[PDB]
Design a protein around this nucleic acid. Structure first.
Ligand SMILES: [Mg+2]
Ligand SMILES: [Mg+2]
Ligand SMILES: [Mg+2]
Ligand SMILES: [Mg+2]
Ligand SMILES: [Mg+2]
Ligand SMILES: [Mg+2]
Ligand SMILES: [Mg+2]
Ligand SMILES: [Mg+2]
Ligand SMILES: [Mg+2]
Ligand SMILES: [Mg+2]
Ligand SMILES: [Mg+2]
Lengths: 202, 157, 49, 289, 63, 167
RNA sequence: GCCUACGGCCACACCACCCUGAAAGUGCCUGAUCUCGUCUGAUCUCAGAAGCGAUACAGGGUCGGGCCUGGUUAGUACCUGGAUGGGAGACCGCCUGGGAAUACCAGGUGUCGUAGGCU
RNA sequence: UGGAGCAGAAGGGCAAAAGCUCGCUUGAUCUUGAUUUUCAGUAUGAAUACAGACCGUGAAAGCGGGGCCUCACGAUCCUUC
RNA sequence: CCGUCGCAGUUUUAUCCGGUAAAGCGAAUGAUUAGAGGUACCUAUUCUCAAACUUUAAAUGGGUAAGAAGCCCGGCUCGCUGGCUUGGAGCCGGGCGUGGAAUGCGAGCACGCCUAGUGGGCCACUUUUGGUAAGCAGAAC
């Protein structure tokens, strides 16, 4: 295919696979969660993200290659069931390609591939694991940067795993029955529902 | 090139608001529109008869003719360099009384009352509206407590 | 700009390096805001007047 | 299992109808065609006759629509007939004609048009339409608000209509829905209509029950016997009512009643009571464990 | 030998070259498109308006 | 209070024939002899090749009885069933029904002209006051503590007819 | 305090469930001779007043759903005008002004007019 | 709460409606002028609101001079009615 | 001359219009990831999106109004309107400038009458379409 230099910038409007854009091939990346996904929230407290710094288009080919490069290092350094990689960029923007060139007469091209439009400060790939595996996530996410264009920086989030709550408050909300784990994440329990649900918790 | 259809591009313009569908409320038909009053124009998709064109949506004009459940409006329409007084016929479901005109007629009723009440007392009151003047001088008490010191916060991720 | 060129005529500033006094109110400061790159105004004292 | 149709997203998108529609009282489709005045009339009142029949009472009103609500001009009820003689049977076609006649005579007495337009003092059940007199004030033009009733031949909404037209009201109508219109021959018989106006269809039923079974005659016409009303007295009872209505059509009410203003419903709980109720339930649940 | 299709680039300058002019507001605007039944009666109101000219002089004297 | 007594609102009989023609007009006379009233033909909603039915083609006949005649036809229907109904015959909405395989047991003598047909007896129960959800003026719901459940329907069948309900 | 008929605004009014309801009213309810309409007086129209508050209806309750209002998110995102600003670029900062919306949290939950009527 | 349908493409609109069914019908009729849209503010096409007739329908208020709205069409000359 | 008409590629005040940016999809349509609970679905959550999706929703922007062509008092005409001077519109007499936002400015005559040239454009900030891109092609200001 063409090099990623041709479809790196978000130059057109988002062109998703819809009833009007038919004939789109299947994306290269199909699995977004790797490792031990069916793990409790207390299993993997630490989480690290691959935050982007460019407003560009990451190809599904680069999303799959960076997924394998990060998985092959977490398996070799943290075991096959000691992490959970979640790719947080689904390729929805379809790329078009013109015919193998009467030159520009009817130049609207046919679908070529799919990219994921990333924003400045948006997470690309997230890895949660034990706290002592902090340096392994930084290196696993660093090796996957070379499989991506542009500039990305590795950030260790203050949240507890893949949840949206800080690690400092997570322990307190668990004791107060405000957070209950449901598989990979937790459910926020407000005080604004029927009281029967409150009796079931306690 | 685009099509010259009458309702081309009126997907959201003539559509009804969210949870505002159904039959038209009755007070819309109970409002009196005399000749010469300033009314707004806003097409309603519930009633397709007597529907104003997409150019007059959001426009304003005065009423010159009144018929059964329909009035005639003199609307200004700038085409290229000639603002044109258009005499259109729309039904009452697509018009509302301009509150700007009613707010001015109330200022006249008060101006005529103030200058009449001031003449009976001999005083002179003002009627001309004045823009927001620069704030006059004033004292600001600290209340004993010092002002809260602010400073830029450090950068976090 | 046409909007800037119209405000500069209402202030009688039709050429470079000319000055006119303006009675400051909300209807005037917003006119001075539409032409900030073209004007350099302030608050003159008595000696300046 | 089955998806909850009335889920959270159901009530978010759910647009309730009008209150009068949710209660099944106002037909808003026929209302805009009945109460809305032409825009070249400029606040000319468009009156209408509101005839409603409950299980025990017949409401006859005359109103015109306004933005702040309908303005009831005159109102006549079938429970006011005991003042004119009719004690029982306040929800029949003969009673509808009375409250309709009372509405037409009470309205004209309020506008002073009672001495100008009298309608048909003698009841014949035939087609009648009041005409305006030159030099005299115009006749009160009104329309019929039938409501949600199936307007078939014989509905009591056309009995009050006939009472209003005979009273002096100028209501456009026809003799097609009056009881006595043969749908096959397409002809209107006025003698059959006069029988329903004076309640002769009740007399033919009271006599038939006496000649068949007293046990059914007493079960069907208990209050007719309690008040002494017989079958041969029906036509003369309503005649004295039709005469007494035209004589004194004005309405008189009681001065006032000073009560203690006792509240009978339950007082709505405040915010402090709802919070404490939850805190007590939370304290009671953790205590039982 | 293609060319340009549509342009409104220099048109705003041409329109404002002489200024966008509104029609001069005239008292007693034209009564075109009014209700013909309304125009009939309004003509009769002016046709017989002199019929009460004597009552007008009598009422003005009372003031 | 007497305003909660379960009663028979209507008995709806159904004879769904596979096809129209002379086979269908015979079943119409069967309901006429039993219910004493003219039946109503039900056209097919859609077309089915396997069932051999075309759209808007009468395939069934149905009636409905309200007064004491509904209790008469139900008594003759429950007699053929030996006054016993399975527990699943009662719906959660308070109604129930059963099927008769031959109309000759209901009281209609067999004749060589018309064939033998099977009916579909369905009883719609109700309390006094269930008409508020059917009238046009001021229509309202029935209410939670007033609609018939499956338990009250089975108990009513075990009391008025003393029938046996199999598990 | 409450109920009718007609309404205006059309969820703060709806929905689920539970509790309570004087008096009148409303409704249920009782019948099919006439009016009228159905396969069937269930609906509809008509006739009536033995029965009760079961339901409808009204009021109240629910750490109720929704809805409504406000806070928060947030001067965040976005944006007018400006620069011989930065950067290979992608884009970003500043100047001049304008300024959001979810999640989250809190509060509220019909109201008004006309006429007649009950405590 | 329309998640169905409304002849068709799509959008909009629509629930005791504009959908479905039924019974009466021919406002899809005869006319004058004004107005809207494409516009040069010319024509055509298609629309809007009246008025004067003559009718339909409904108990009536009303509604209707084609299709729920946005497309579904044609100058001079000539022929024909 | 002040004053008053009249005027404006501009503000202010008052009041309308819109569905773009952004946002949302634990809200509808469409797309989409991973577990959990109850019994392949079903409930409660979770990841990522729309140009031909949207509950929300700007900035900029569009329309109107800011008086004598008015206000107030008293009458007249009508064949329209009609329970009733009841509307409506027109007309007549009398009374009342504090001209009833800021600023600038002379306007009007369908911006009169006749009228040449032009009807190959091109470029830049921003917005934006096709195209890998183009000293490319095509738009808005
Ligand atoms: Mg197109
Ligand atoms: Mg060219
Ligand atoms: Mg071309
Ligand atoms: Mg709640
Ligand atoms: Mg909020
Ligand atoms: Mg006509
Ligand atoms: Mg020229
Ligand atoms: Mg030329
Ligand atoms: Mg050339
Ligand atoms: Mg170019
Ligand atoms: Mg070129």
């Amino acid at each position: 295919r063409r090099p990623a230099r041709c479809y790196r910038y978000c130059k057109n409007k988002p062109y998703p696979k819809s009833r009007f854009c038919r004939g789109v091939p299947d994306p290269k990346i199909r699995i977004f969660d790797l490792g031990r996904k069916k793990a409790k929230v207390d299993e993997f407290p630490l989480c690290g993200h691959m935050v982007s710094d460019e407003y560009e288009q990451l190809s599904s080919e680069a999303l799959e290659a960076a997924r394998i490069c990060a998985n092959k290092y977490m398996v070799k350094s943290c075991g096959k069931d000691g992490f959970h990689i979640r790719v947080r960029l689904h390729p929805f923007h379809v790329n078009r390609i013109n015919k193998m060139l009467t030159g520009m007469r009817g130049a609207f091209g046919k679908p070529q591939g799919t990219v994921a439009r990333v924003n400045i400060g948006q997470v690309i790939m997230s890895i949660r694991t034990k706290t002592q595996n902090k340096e392994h996530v930084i290196e696993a996410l660093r090796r996957a940067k070379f499989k991506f264009p542009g500039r990305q920086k590795i950030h260790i989030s203050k949240k507890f795993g893949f949840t949206k709550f800080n690690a400092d408050i997570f322990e307190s909300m668990l004791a107060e029955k405000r957070l209950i784990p449901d598989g990979c994440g937790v459910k926020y329990i407000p005080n604004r529902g029927p009281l029967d649900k409150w009796r079931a918790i306690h | 090139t685009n099509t010259r259809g009458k309702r081309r591009g009126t997907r959201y313009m003539f559509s009804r608001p969210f949870r505002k569908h159904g039959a038209v409320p009755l007070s819309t038909y109970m409002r009196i529109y005399k000749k010469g009053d300033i009314v707004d124009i806003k097409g309603m998709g519930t009633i397709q008869k007597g529907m104003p064109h997409k150019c007059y949506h959001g426009k304003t004009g005065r009423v010159y003719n009144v018929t059964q459940h329909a009035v005639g409006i003199i609307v200004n329409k700038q085409l290229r360099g000639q603002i044109l007084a258009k005499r259109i016929n729309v039904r009452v479901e697509h018009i509302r009384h301009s509150k700007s005109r009613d707010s001015f007629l109330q200022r006249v009723k008060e101006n005529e009352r103030k200058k009449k009440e001031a003449k009976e007392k001999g005083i002179w009151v003002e009627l001309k509206r004045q823009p927001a003047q620069p704030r006059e001088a004033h004292f600001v008490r600290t209340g004993g407590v010092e002002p809260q010191l602010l400073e830029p916060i450090p950068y976090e991720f | 700009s046409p909007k800037v060129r119209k405000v500069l005529q209402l202030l009688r500033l039709r050429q470079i390096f000319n000055g006119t006094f303006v009675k400051l109110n909300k209807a005037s400061i917003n006119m001075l805001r539409l032409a900030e790159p073209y004007i350099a105004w302030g608050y003159p004292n008595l000696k300046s007047v | 299992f089955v998806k909850v149709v009335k889920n959270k997203a159901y009530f978010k998108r759910y647009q309730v109808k009008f209150r009068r529609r949710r209660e099944g009282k106002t037909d808003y489709y026929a209302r805009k065609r009945l109460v809305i005045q032409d825009k070249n009339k400029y606040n000319t009142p468009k009156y209408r006759m509101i005839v409603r029949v409950t299980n025990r009472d017949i409401i006859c009103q005359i109103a015109y629509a306004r933005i702040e609500g309908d303005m009831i001009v005159c109102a006549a009820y079938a429970h006011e007939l005991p003042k004119y003689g009719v004690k029982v049977g306040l929800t029949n076609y003969a009673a509808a004609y009375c409250t309709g006649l009372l509405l037409a005579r009470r309205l004209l007495n309020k506008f002073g048009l009672d001495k100008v337009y009298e309608g048909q003092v003698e009841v014949t059940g035939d087609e009648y339409n009041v005409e305006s007199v030159d030099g005299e004030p115009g006749a009160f033009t009104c329309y019929l608000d039938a409501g949600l009733t199936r307007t078939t031949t014989g509905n009591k909404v056309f009995g009050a209509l006939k009472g209003a037209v005979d009273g002096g009201l100028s209501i456009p109508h026809s003799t097609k829905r009056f009881p006595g219109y043969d749908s096959e021959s397409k002809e209107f018989n006025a003698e059959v209509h006069r029988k329903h106006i004076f309640g002769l269809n009740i007399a033919e039923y009271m006599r038939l029950l006496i000649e068949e079974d007293e046990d059914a005659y007493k079960k069907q016409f208990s209050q007719y016997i309690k008040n002494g009303v017989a079958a041969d007295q029906l036509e003369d009872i309503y005649k004295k009512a039709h005469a007494g209505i035209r004589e004194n059509p004005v309405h008189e009410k009681k001065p006032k009643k000073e009560v203690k203003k006792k509240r009978w419903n339950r007082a709505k709980l405040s915010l402090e009571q709802k919070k404490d109720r939850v805190a007590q339930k939370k304290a009671s649940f953790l205590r039982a464990q | 030998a293609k060319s340009k299709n549509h342009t409104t680039h220099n048109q705003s300058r041409k329109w404002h070259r002489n200024g966008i002019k509104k029609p001069k507001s005239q008292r007693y605007e034209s009564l075109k498109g009014v209700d013909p039944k309304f125009m009939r009666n309004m003509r009769f109101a002016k046709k017989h308006n002199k019929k009460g000219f004597k009552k007008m002089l009598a009422n003005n004297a009372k003031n | 209070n007497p305003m909660r007594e379960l009663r028979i609102r209507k008995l709806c009989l159904n004879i769904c024939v596979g096809e129209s023609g002379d086979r269908l007009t015979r079943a119409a006379k069967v309901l006429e002899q039993l219910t004493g009233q003219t039946p109503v033909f039900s056209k097919a909603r859609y077309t089915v090749r396997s069932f051999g039915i075309r759209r808007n083609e009468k395939i069934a006949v149905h009636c409905t009885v309200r007064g004491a005649k509904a209790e008469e036809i139900l008594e003759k229907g429950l007699k053929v069933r030996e006054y016993e109904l399975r527990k699943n015959n009662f719906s959660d909405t308070g109604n129930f029904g059963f099927g008769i395989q031959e109309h000759i047991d209901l009281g209609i003598k067999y004749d060589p002209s018309i064939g033998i047909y099977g009916l579909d007896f369905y009883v719609v129960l109700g309390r006094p006051g269930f008409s508020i959800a059917d009238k046009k003026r001021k229509r309202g719901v029935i209410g939670s503590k007033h609609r018939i459940g499956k338990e009250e329907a089975m108990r009513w069948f075990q009391q008025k007819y003393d029938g046996i309900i199999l598990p």
